[PDB]
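Sample 1 of the test manifest.
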Amino acid sequence: FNKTPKEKFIEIIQNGNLGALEKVFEEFFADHIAMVELLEKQGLTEMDVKNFILENGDFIEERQNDIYIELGAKILGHEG
Amino acid sequence: FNKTPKEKFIEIIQNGNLGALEKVFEEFFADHIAMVELLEKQGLTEMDVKNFILENGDFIEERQNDIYIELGAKILGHEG
């Protein structure tokens, strides 16, 4: 209302209990790690990742909001 | 000392100021998003990602600690 999806996600993180946050971050990080391994196995690098970001700013901004929403809902619901 | 890297990262998130957290999460999420796009462009899917996780548990646990450390140091230092 008086907050962006970003601002609301941060507030959710700041006020989350340990169990809820650990469950959500563990799985998100596991995803991250797995994607790095799958990309390297493909011969793709961190540089290709950063350049994708630098060249697709509108795409990135849109998905960032969806991620703020998704992860916040998981935390407030105690999910994974 | 009396805390795991996981416990210390969570404490860091919980006590972080808005600017510090937003900067660190924005870039981490941007990375995430970019890696999803690069994997799909390769014809790799979310299912391949989850199965990687399920079959490489020791690898995942080790990297998760490194991520807890890395992101916490960025937040406590106000970095990106």
